[PDB]
Symmetry: C3
Subunit: 225 residues, 3 copies
């Protein structure tokens, strides 16, 4: 299958991302730095396994909608289900967010992937978009809290915290919101962009939001207590 190379290239990059983070994580014995290193290595590990599941073709399935037999990488939702809230925890711990606010976001994130998955496998075409919309909605809630609520409390901590957060926020804020767009125009939605392009688009995005995101966070001197 044409996108095979993109799934390979992502399996690889996620692999190396995990291993790098795993080694870079050796000899870190601060409770706070641990937490971070822990979460930030899980994302690409989980990501790695799902990229491989897609590469080997275990993450793939045939959903009928549109009078056609459309291909749907369901693995992506299995992956995101776990990676995406972890990624949020990273941000939340950093700014020192309320037990409350975290539960809020994870809840929202859950629903977001939750509905997105439902969407992806729905057999009535127009219906899929109702799911998209609901998910897209949950996203706007995350992006809100991240942008408004978080930047407030982010700005009332150490110089290194606020800075690192701000970059990490920005990256997420931008790249995260690219996913629904891709979804919509892609084979899950309109079928405007072809699968091989969609996969590549997603593949670049994932690598960035995870390894890229991770590289920034774990490199910073801001993960410490």
């Amino acid at each position: 299958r044409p996108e095979w190379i993109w799934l390979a290239l992502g399996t690889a990059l996620m692999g190396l991302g995990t291993l790098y983070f795993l080694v870079k994580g050796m000899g870190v014995s601060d409770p706070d730095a641990k937490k971070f290193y822990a979460i930030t290595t899980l994302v690409p590990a989980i990501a790695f396994t799902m990229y491989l599941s897609m590469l080997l073709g275990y993450g793939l399935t045939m959903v009928p909608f549109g009078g056609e037999q459309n291909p749907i990488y369901w693995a992506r939702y299995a992956d995101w289900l776990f990676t995406t809230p972890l990624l949020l925890l990273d941000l939340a711990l950093l700014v020192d967010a309320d037990q409350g606010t975290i539960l809020a976001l994870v809840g929202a994130d859950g629903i977001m992937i939750g509905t997105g998955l439902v969407g992806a496998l729905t057999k009535v075409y127009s219906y899929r978009f109702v799911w998209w919309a609901i998910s897209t909605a949950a996203m706007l809630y995350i992006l809100y809290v991240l942008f408004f609520g978080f930047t407030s409390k982010a700005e009332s901590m150490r110089p290194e915290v606020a800075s690192t957060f701000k970059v990490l926020r920005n990256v997420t804020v931008v790249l995260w919101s690219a996913y629904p767009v891709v979804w919509l125009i892609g084979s899950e939605g309109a079928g405007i962009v072809p699968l091989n392009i969609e996969t590549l688009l997603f593949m670049v995005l994932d690598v960035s939001t995870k390894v890229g995101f991770g590289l920034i966070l774990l490199r910073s001197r801001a993960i410490f207590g």
Copy 2:
């Protein structure tokens, strides 16, 4: 389908419930009130999505048992899986429960929905009831802790706490135990009550245990620190 209206009416009520709670939650910046507001809005959000999934027919499936092809809304279990422990957490935080007790209840709740679901999709008629029984059993465990162990510690806190808890306990204690009953006589079990009635019965129950429940809790002056 006859119950379509009940699923609509519940989608709606859960929708509004979520939105009411979402707005009512704006401008609440106490760490404790947040926690509550967060949990109590997830419930109806999750509930909203699952009611919609049933309405659109994504939460529905055909399970054969009894030499028939019986309609099972599986989405209910996907819903309850998450909503029900959250609801417990609400009660648990209110009384200031031990880290232990909470894990106890969530585990029990898990098993209750867990087996419930297993029961619901079991193809051997008599077998379903074994599952019912096991689930019904875990329920009696929660209702216990709630009634005995919780009311103890509930009673050794502020006046507003004990009061609010007591109502909330009562509401849960009564309406929660109605679910198995309905399950049993309904199309999951005996098939005495018809699906459309079952759905309405369930719909009324859900709206109460969630929005109803929530309305009470979020209105009280007892969610604060």
Copy 3:
């Protein structure tokens, strides 16, 4: 089916395990002893439900690999998914492990069962072993942290803690690593050992790692604060 008796025997042992733990747990009102009792009872309850689901034949499924139709107790992965991380929590709470480290382990455990399941239901034979290997790899990570990281901080606490831990570690360290071996040689992998034997092998293992493990822990005077 030949192994029916083994699943029965396990259902039974897990049942009694649960009930014993449930009774023995009455009248324990220390926050730390609660936590432990809570987790250690969940394992066998969860275990009980999945051994029944396997006995009743709800946990079973036909996976095609090797040009044959192989039988795969998928329930095992449903069980382990939850039992195995709880088992680790028990160990981690005991030694007083970092929020970080726990999250680390649970993560690894998730991936372990995560991939194991993927493996079990994979339709390409050689493929199954790639999953095994990845899973087996996560295991080595858990066994490491348990053996190296944990024994360090374990040895810097009370005499009773270090001792009990050391036993519990050892039991886990040995018995846990038997599972992959069994998997490989069994009907999931090579199909060297027969299912009825595999089941018996697993059956003994589960009972030991759960009830046995639990009997040791809950009997000890080290679960207290």
